[PDB]
Design a protein around this ligand. Structure first.
Ligand code: CL7
Ligand code: CL7
Ligand code: CL7
Ligand code: CL7
Ligand code: CL7
Ligand code: CL7
Ligand SMILES: CCCCCCCCCCCCCCCCCC(=O)OC[C@H](CO[C@@H]1O[C@H](CO)[C@H](O)[C@H](O)[C@H]1O)OC(=O)CCCCCCCCCCCCCCCCC
Ligand SMILES: CCCCCCCCCCCCCCCC(=O)OC[C@H](COP(=O)(O)OC[C@@H](O)CO)OC(=O)CCCCCCCCCCCCCCC
Ligand SMILES: CC1=C(/C=C/C(C)=C/C=C/C(C)=C/C=C/C=C(C)/C=C/C=C(C)/C=C/C2=C[C@H](C)[C@H](O)CC2(C)C)C(C)(C)C[C@@H](O)C1
Ligand SMILES: CC1=CCCC(C)(C)[C@H]1/C=C/C(C)=C/C=C/C(C)=C/C=C/C=C(C)/C=C/C=C(C)/C=C/C1=C(C)CCCC1(C)C
Ligand SMILES: CC1=CCCC(C)(C)[C@H]1/C=C/C(C)=C/C=C/C(C)=C/C=C/C=C(C)/C=C/C=C(C)/C=C\C1=C(C)CCCC1(C)C
Lengths: 331, 479, 31, 65, 30, 68, 36, 323, 35
């Protein structure tokens, strides 16, 4: 099925069988998202069930409550959990999202048409036809997903600034913090250029909520602009086409800029692993975004967990799928 | 005919008779379990749970029974130090039935039933199932049979972990304090936090048997469905049962070694209330440290719980026995009856010195009473020698706190010498030999016998694994 | 000494011995 | 034959001297912690430096050092 | 020319020669 | 060759697929990973038992019995 | 129905002597410890 | 032909030596074990664990160099170069005795690799692998002496330090503290080894002295000679050589079981009736009692310095003597 | 929380992976070379 390595039709590899089946692939992703959303809500409800008021969160071993309390959910002045009901509401809403995703996945796996190339010729569904070769098709997908991520980030920032704000570590309580919008100052962190001097952990030495909220505004605007870029153009440019790549497809650097299913998957996997490593640094050092009132002070274990996951995705998955895609570029 | 060391190969090609001999072996094993437990019951003294526990009494299977729930007897007595109350009142309270005698009865019944099944399968060796659809030669598929067996064992492991061990639907398991004082049979709750890998915390065991249980079930299901691979199938010769024998023997040897390790080093599975103290608790001064801290914590000497002082005797160590010193420990130094109390020694100048305790290694030790500062004060010279630092020349009194010799002060040189030797043997104690004709030479507890026997078994079974692997891999040659 | 020492020695001497003699006899009777 | 003779002549004595100087320059004592002949004891430090604790052995040696 | 035998011969000889030199050096220590 | 009832029940599990294997390597690669995984697991346990590894708040000794 | 797999058991005279020597020598060695 | 078949054929290719798959485990592990021993004797000293000078730098002799065991305080710690003890410091790793663990563990895996290698070679040639089963004995001895014994004791400190005089110290220590010579399993081991030497000697002499004037020797003459000289003789060649194989291996296994027994102090240290009878009257004196006295003396005179960590202090008065 | 001993074990896994990878890479690469 669009691959001939040695073992394409093995049951333990059977997911590759959906390489071209667009409808089934969409269903599979939706079901997976159902899993990813079931876990948080279920474990939040389980946590709130055993939560004790006198003891502090770091001493209760909660791995989802701290992230919710960091956003001012159910906490008051002094950083103590007051009311537990909003955590329960968050869990229930994740249950709802998971149920909707699972319904969609069941529809597209069984009721929906397996391959959208078999859609009835502009039936609201041919507009969703995509091919792992044509660039234009996948461009609009990237654009719309960027739209959603950007709207999420902007919503987070707007909530922080105007409505009910976040738990600011320095001010000791939940406040609508006034954002900092000095773009050079924000983008300096990416090279470690913190105001207090260069720092080893980029983006992680922020010492005030204003920096993070301004950065989120910047990221939201940037992602919205990129969404416009990809939705409105869909055409390959001399950046993607005609860029150097080293591969045994042709021994040595080439300017081909190849495209393939495994290659797209590999770039995505590498991106995820990189985010894992960046988050590892973040939770190791940045305690503005992780108030030790909630997550505790010692946080080497969580950072190491993130590190391992990031290495597995960036090195293992990224390399494996990149090599397979480059080899499949011998068609 | 066959050589005497190959007589049992006459069942190699016969699945029915192979199953028959396995069933007969199972019948023998269950019968031995029953008979051994019966004998131990018939030679037991429930009166004294403190200075004569089961491990002092040469019990072998009673601690293994007691580990996971069985404590009382139909005659009434419990091993925890209280007459058994029939707290059972309802169904799911078979606990009044599954005492020692209930387990014995069930095991003997299983022995009989398995023996009958073995006879049946020996006679009906040619059932149609052993033969494939269209070939006279009997042929079994070992991979799927392994899958079925593994699934069964995974179900039973998951049930044991989740129901029996947790106490939800079972007696639970034996738990205790760090010093072997309070011993309950209570349920445990599983926790997946990393401290469940601590071997001495029982919460791991449940957490193991649940998760591992599930792992076997999945592992069963896969093998009940999945076929082998030509590569592996040809390499390991999966069509030949001898490979199963080789791999199983290796596994069982590894299991024996791991069990010996836990038994010798102690763990949550082996509590000292059941199997007795290890040899490292004497070496590290574990109980002496604890007692000394407790007394130093303001408690008077007579207020020290007698189990905690019995554990500090060196006669309890499993590293003081012998290979042919047979029988229970009480056949050795005799059965204890009373603790004479903690003795203290003083010399002419009134300085308080202490006796150095004999390590596990030495069969005999030279008695040396030394100043706490590391200077030898007095001693007992060799059997007949002239001295300058001596017991009498310097003169030594001994005074006893608590116990039978409370407040007493022996300054009679033979008495001081006797109690010096006792003090270097741990804690002085009242031992009786007249009841059993005890020989005064020590013996090892249940823990030592376990460790020795199964280390020998593991060592032999490794050679067995090598031999059977050789006969599997070289099958074409070994004919 | 051990009252069971003599019994253990006797059974150790006897059981393998009777086993071996039985095997040899039922071998030699056969041609 | 002949070719390798040049390489071995150039190299082997250099390796021999490498070991020689590794001992002579006293580097081995630092690498392996082996005491100098005067380092076994001070003028009166005739006590033995025996480790008594498993957990902090290296630091205890540093005290013995 | 890097045969497995070359590796083996060198992995043996190199440390062997180094240690022979070291021991010789120790022989001349007072 | 008695045709018992229980034999009828169990013959399919006994030798329906007797002597059948899939060609090549099949699932053997996946098995490899599992082995390596347990090779870590056991190893970790050993060191935890050996006090080479000291997990935080996990005192591998008789003191851990505190709480029973 | 007879079982094909049945086979007799053989032990010649020399093997009997070897086995008896092994057994008697082991008994002589270990009796001094069994009596303890 | 995948990469695996290429690798397999490459391993099995004829060379000066045969590598096989087993080589991947044998050669690195064997080489590391040998190198560890050589380094430990040449440079590393035991001044901090046993208070000895057991290295050439110290000025020791070939008969007195030893890779001495780790200290007593470490218990049975594996002493990894990166463990809680060494913590990555090579010098502390050497001083603490980590070279002993390095050498012994890599030796274990070298022995395992060698047994696997014999399995593989016999598989290639196509003959019964009796050689591997024979080699099973040495592995039993090694595992019993260097692993099971120190594991049954307090620490690695009681294992045999890799050396010559250190091994002699181990022998004398075993006699003093476990009374090993009186252990029946050691007696079977001694009988096995001495009988193996006897079999080798007389088999060689017989084959040389019944050579045909050209298998190659008169089995009939040898059989008659031994029957009329000694009484019994091998009339079967296969039995003769299987017996030659069987005797020393069995001796090694019996000794292995003896050594695992004494690892738990489950030792045959004394005969109870003799101790009782000696207690009743002092005139009763036998060789066993004097052996007991020698054991007492060796324990007393060796303990203060052998187990230096224990800080034993026995005065002259308590030391046993022949007065 | 990570302790020094656990970090040492993790570095051990790194080094062991490196050693095994270099050994296996050398073996497979040399086998592929003189095919
Ligand atoms: C074991 C390897 C495996 C994994 C773990 C896996 N899949 Mg698949 N996978 C899908 C989703 C999926 C999700 C959402 C998901 C995880 O989130 C996974 N998968 C994961 C569906 C969209 C898609 C359709 C699934 C589909 O059609 O399912 C209906 C058919 C069956 C028999 C139901 C499966 C039930 C199991 C037998 C239960 C046995 C347990 C036992 C009693 C105890 C799919 C496929 C398929 C296969 C195969 C062989 C697999 N897989 C295999 C796997 C298709 O052919 C098949 C395929 O697409 O063929 C063209
Ligand atoms: C090497 C000099 C430099 C350049 C060329 C550079 N970064 Mg960084 N840089 C990032 C993005 C980035 C982008 C998009 C980018 C453009 O190509 C660069 N960088 C480039 C973030 C993902 C990341 C913040 C986490 C980052 C860092 C970081 C550092 C440091 C020191 C740098 N950098 C430095 C640089 C983190 O602390 C830190 C780090 O350790 O990660 C590598
Ligand atoms: C406005 C800034 C912007 C953002 C937010 C953004 N992109 Mg781009 N971006 C891509 C992915 C992408 C992802 C997955 C992603 C978010 O995760 C983003 N982008 C985000 C690749 C599909 C594509 C090729 C990148 C490449 O490999 O070259 C790309 C480009 C490209 C550009 C440009 C100008 C951008 N971008 C811009 C952005 C190509 O020319 C260039 C382009 O159109 O080449 C045809
Ligand atoms: C651990 C390294 C690793 C990572 C992190 C990773 N993969 Mg794989 N991976 C896939 C998806 C995937 C996604 C969506 C994803 C990120 O979310 C990853 N992977 C990530 C499926 C398309 C595909 C089917 C696996 C499958 O689902 O079965 C897959 C494979 C495969 C492999 C292997 C070895 C991997 N991987 C490995 C990884 C197939 O054999 C196997 C393969 O393709 O052999 C034919
Ligand atoms: C001692 C090393 C060893 C081990 C532990 C071992 N085998 Mg063997 N072994 C077999 C099964 C077996 C099982 C099921 C099993 C594990 O449960 C073992 N083995 C294990 C049979 C398939 C096959 C033939 C079996 C066979 O013919 O057995 C005949 C044996 C007889 C009449 C008596 C031998 C005397 C023993 C002193 C018995 C003493 C009582 C007993 C100890 C009580 C304790 C119980 C328990 C704790 C041990 C076999 C062989 C054989 C040998 C040899 C040399 C061995 N083995 C060796 C081992 C064949 O020649 C021979 C062979 O294969 O040649 C063709
Ligand atoms: C015959 C049934 C039987 C079996 C199979 C059996 N025991 Mg007992 N058994 C014990 C251990 C044991 C172990 C570790 C073990 C399995 O390995 C067994 N047993 C097995 C000890 C805890 C305990 C006493 C310790 C005790 O006496 O242990 C045995 C002592 C010695 C010198 C035997 C060692 C023999 C050599 C290895 C021989 C090898 C020769 C060579 C191969 C050739 C015990 C008893 C005892 C009894 C009795 C009657 C038994 N048993 C019986 C059995 C006590 O009096 C008695 C009892 O219950 O009251 C004290
Ligand atoms: C496996 C073994 C395979 C080979 C076959 C067996 C070999 C020979 C075994 C002979 C046993 C002789 C027992 C003598 C008993 C005796 O003298 O006292 C008789 C003793 C009991 O002793 C009595 O005990 C009483 C209290 O109960 C009183 O103390 C009495 O005074 C006392 O005499 O009997 C037993 O203990 C019987 C059970 C023995 C259990 C042995 C466990 C250890 C096995 C280790 C196997 C290692 C194998 C290594 C092989 C290399
Ligand atoms: C649970 C109940 C258990 C009850 C006990 C069971 C006991 C079973 C039998 C045990 C003894 C078996 C003996 C077989 C004896 C026997 O028949 O041997 C001869 C036999 C010959 O094998 P073949 O295949 O050539 O012929 C087989 C037939 O002759 C007999 O089946 O070979 C072996 O058995 C190999 C092992 C020899 C072992 C002995 C070698 C050493 C001999 C000398 C040692 C003592 C002297 C030492 C002087 C210092
Ligand atoms: C295309 C190409 C390739 C790939 C090259 C690579 C690897 C390109 C890498 C591209 C990357 C990593 C792009 C990512 C850029 C990251 C950006 C732009 C992050 C911006 C984040 C900002 C601005 C946030 C800032 C904040 C916001 C945040 C909320 C916190 O409050 C902190 C604070 C305030 C710093 C090859 C390898 C195929 C060939 C190359 O030659 C060319
Ligand atoms: C043979 C003999 C009999 C007749 C007389 C005669 C004089 C000739 C006599 C010979 C005597 C002589 C001079 C013998 C010389 C012998 C010697 C020293 C041989 C030594 C070779 C040295 C070797 C391998 C060392 C290898 C070292 C290794 C891997 C190091 C391993 C390492 C360790 C130990 C710590 C961690 C780091 C690392 C690198 C993994
Ligand atoms: C028959 C019948 C049918 C219907 C139900 C009913 C209950 C009535 C049933 C009756 C069942 C009964 C009474 C079953 C009794 C079974 C018994 C007692 C089985 C035997 C157990 C004894 C065993 C294994 C022997 C072990 C002996 C061994 C190792 C040999 C040597 C020994 C070893 C190697 C270790 C050291 C000690 C020693 C002795 C040297």
């Amino acid at each position: 099925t669009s691959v001939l390595s040695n073992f394409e039709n093995e049951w333990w590899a059977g997911n590759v069988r959906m390489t071209d089946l667009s409808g089934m692939l969409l269903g599979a992703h939706l079901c997976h998202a159902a899993l990813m959303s079931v876990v948080p809500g279920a474990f939040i409800v389980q946590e709130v069930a055993r939560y004790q008021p006198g003891v502090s969160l770091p001493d209760q071993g909660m791995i989802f409550m701290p992230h919710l309390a960091a956003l001012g959910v159910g906490v008051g002045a002094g950083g103590e959990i007051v009311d537990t009901y909003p955590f329960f509401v968050i869990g229930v809403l994740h249950f709802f999202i998971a149920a909707v995703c699972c319904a969609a996945g069941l529809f597209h796996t069984f009721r929906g048409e397996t391959d959208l190339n078999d859609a009835p010729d502009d039936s609201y569904a041919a507009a969703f036809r995509y091919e792992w070769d044509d660039f234009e098709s996948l461009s609009t997908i990237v654009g719309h997903h960027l739209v959603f991520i950007s709207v999420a980030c902007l919503i987070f920032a707007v909530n922080a600034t105007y409505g009910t704000g976040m738990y600011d570590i320095n001010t000791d309580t939940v406040h609508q913090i006034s954002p900092n919008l000095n773009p050079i100052t924000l983008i300096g962190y990416l090279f470690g250029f913190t105001p207090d001097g260069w720092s080893g952990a980029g983006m992680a030495a922020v010492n005030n909520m204003e920096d993070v909220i301004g950065g989120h505004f910047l990221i939201g605007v940037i992602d919205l602009l990129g969404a416009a870029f990809h939705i409105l153009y869909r055409k390959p440019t001399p950046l993607f086409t005609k860029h150097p790549v080293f591969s045994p497809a042709n021994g040595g650097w080439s300017n081909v800029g190849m495209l393939n299913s495994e290659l797209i998957l590999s770039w995505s996997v590498a991106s995820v692993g990189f985010m894992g490593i960046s988050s590892s640094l973040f939770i190791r050092y940045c305690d503005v975004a992780y108030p030790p009132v909630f997550h505790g002070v010692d946080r080497t274990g969580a950072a190491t967990l993130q590190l391992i996951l990031g290495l597995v995705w960036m090195l293992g998955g990224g390399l494996w799928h990149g090599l397979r895609g480059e080899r499949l570029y011998a068609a | 005919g066959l050589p005497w060391y190959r007589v049992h190969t006459v069942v190699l090609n016969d699945p029915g008779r192979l199953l028959s001999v396995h069933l007969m072996h199972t019948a023998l094993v269950s019968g031995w379990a029953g008979s051994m437990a019966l004998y131990e019951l018939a030679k037991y003294d429930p009166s004294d749970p403190v200075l004569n526990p089961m491990w002092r009494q040469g019990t072998f299977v009673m601690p293994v029974m007691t580990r996971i729930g069985v404590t009382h007897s139909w005659s009434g007595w419990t091993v925890t130090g209280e007459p058994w109350v029939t707290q059972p009142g309802i169904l799911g309270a078979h606990l009044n039935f599954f005492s020692y005698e209930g387990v014995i009865l069930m095991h003997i019944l299983a022995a009989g039933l398995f023996f009958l099944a073995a006879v049946w399968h020996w006679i009906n060796w040619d059932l149609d199932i052993y033969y494939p659809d269209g070939s006279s030669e009997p042929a079994s598929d070992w991979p799927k049979i392994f899958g079925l067996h593994l699934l069964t064992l995974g179900i039973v492991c998951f049930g044991f972990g989740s129901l029996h061990l947790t106490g939800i639907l079972g007696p639970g398991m034996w738990v205790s304090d760090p010093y072997g004082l309070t011993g309950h049979v209570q349920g445990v709750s599983p926790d997946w936090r990393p401290f469940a890998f601590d071997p001495y915390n029982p919460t791991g065991l449940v957490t193991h048997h649940i998760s591992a249980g599930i792992a076997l079930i999945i592992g069963g299901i896969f093998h009940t469905v999945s076929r082998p691979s030509e590569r592996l199938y040809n390499a390991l010769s999966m069509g030949n049962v001898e490979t199963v024998l080789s791999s199983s023997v290796a596994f069982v040897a590894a299991a024996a070694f791991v069990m010996v390790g836990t038994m010798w080093y102690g763990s949550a599975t082996t509590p000292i209330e059941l199997f007795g103290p290890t040899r490292y608790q004497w070496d590290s001064g574990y109980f002496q440290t604890e007692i000394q801290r407790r007394v130093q914590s303001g408690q008077t000497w007579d207020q020290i719980p007698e189990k905690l002082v019995f554990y500090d005797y060196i006669g309890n160590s499993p590293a003081k026995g012998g290979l042919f010193r047979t029988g229970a420990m009480n056949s050795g130094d005799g059965i204890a009856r009373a603790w004479e109390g903690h003795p203290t020694f003083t010399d002419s100048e009134g300085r308080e010195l202490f006796v150095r305790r004999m390590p596990n290694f030495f069969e005999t030790f030279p008695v040396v009473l030394t100043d706490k500062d590391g200077v030898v004060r007095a001693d007992i010279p060799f059997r007949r020698a002239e001295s300058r630092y001596s017991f009498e020349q310097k003169g030594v009194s001994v005074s006893f706190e608590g116990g039978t010799l409370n407040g007493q002060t022996f300054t009679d040189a033979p008495s001081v010498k006797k109690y010096a030797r006792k003090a270097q043997l741990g804690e002085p104690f009242e031992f009786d030999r007249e009841t059993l004709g005890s020989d005064g030479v020590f013996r090892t507890s249940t823990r030592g016998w376990f460790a020795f026997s199964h280390s020998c078994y593991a060592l032999l079974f490794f050679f067995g694994h090598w031999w059977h692997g050789a006969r599997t891999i070289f099958k074409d040659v070994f004919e | 000494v051990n009252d069971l020492g003599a019994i253990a020695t006797a059974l150790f001497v006897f059981i393998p011995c009777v086993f071996l003699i039985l095997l040899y006899a039922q071998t030699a009777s056969r041609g | 034959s002949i070719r390798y003779w040049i390489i071995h002549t150039i190299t082997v004595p250099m390796l021999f001297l490498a070991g020689w100087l590794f001992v002579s320059t006293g580097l081995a004592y630092d690498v392996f912690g082996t005491p100098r002949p005067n380092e076994y004891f001070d003028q009166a430090r005739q006590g033995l430096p025996l480790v008594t604790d498993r957990y902090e052995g290296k630091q205890q040696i540093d005290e013995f050092t | 020319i890097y045969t497995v035998r070359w590796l083996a011969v060198h992995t043996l000889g190199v440390p062997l020669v180094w240690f022979l030199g070291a021991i010789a050096s120790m022989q001349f220590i007072n | 060759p008695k045709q018992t009832w229980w034999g009828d029940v169990l013959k399919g599990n006994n030798n329906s697929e007797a002597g059948k294997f899939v060609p090549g390597w099949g699932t053997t690669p996946v098995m490899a990973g599992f082995v390596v995984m347990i090779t870590l697991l056991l190893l970790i346990m050993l060191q935890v038992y050996n006090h080479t590894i000291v997990l935080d708040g996990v005192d591998a000794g008789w003191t851990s019995l505190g709480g029973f | 129905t007879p079982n094909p797999n049945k086979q007799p058991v053989e032990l010649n005279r020399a093997s009997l002597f070897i086995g008896l020597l092994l057994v008697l020598v082991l008994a002589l060695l270990f009796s001094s410890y069994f009596f303890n | 032909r995948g990469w695996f078949d290429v690798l397999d054929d490459w391993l099995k290719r004829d060379r000066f030596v045969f590598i096989g798959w087993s080589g991947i485990l044998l050669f690195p592990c064997a080489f590391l074990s040998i190198g560890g021993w050589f380094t430990g004797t040449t440079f590393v000293t035991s001044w901090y664990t046993h208070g000895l000078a057991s290295s050439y730098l110290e000025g020791a002799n070939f008969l007195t160099v030893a890779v001495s065991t780790p200290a007593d305080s470490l218990g049975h710690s594996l002493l990894l170069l990166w463990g809680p003890e060494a913590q990555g410091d090579f010098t502390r790793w050497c001083q603490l005795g980590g070279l002993w663990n390095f050498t012994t563990l890599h030796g274990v895996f070298g022995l395992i690799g060698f047994m696997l290698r014999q399995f593989e070679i016999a598989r290639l040639v196509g003959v019964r692998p009796y050689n591997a089963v024979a080699f099973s004995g040495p592995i039993a001895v090694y595992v019993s002496v260097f692993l099971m014994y120190p594991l049954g004791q307090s620490s690695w400190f009681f294992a045999p330090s890799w050396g010559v005089t250190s091994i002699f110290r181990f022998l004398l220590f075993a006699q003093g503290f476990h009374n090993l010579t009186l252990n029946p399993f050691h007696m079977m081991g001694v009988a096995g080894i001495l009988g193996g030497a006897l079999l080798c000697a007389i088999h060689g002499a017989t084959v040389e002295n019944t050579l045909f004037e050209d298998e190659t020797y008169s089995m009939v003459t040898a059989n008659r000679f031994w029957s009329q000289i000694f009484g019994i003789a091998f009339s079967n060649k296969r039995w003769l050589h299987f017996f030659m194989l069987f005797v020393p291996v069995t001796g090694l296994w019996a000794s292995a079981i003896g050594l695992v027994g004494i690892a738990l102090n489950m030792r045959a240290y004394d005969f109870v009736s003799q101790e009782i009878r000696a207690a009743e009257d002092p005139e009763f004196e036998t060789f066993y009692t004097k052996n007991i006295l020698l054991n007492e003396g060796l324990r007393a005179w060796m303990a203060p310095q052998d187990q230096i960590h224990e800080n034993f202090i026995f005065p002259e008065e308590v030391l046993p003597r022949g007065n | 929380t990570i302790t020094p001993s656990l970090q040492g074990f993790f570095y051990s896994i790194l080094f062991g992976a490196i050693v095994l990878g270099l050994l296996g890479g050398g073996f497979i690469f040399f086998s592929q070379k003189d095919k």
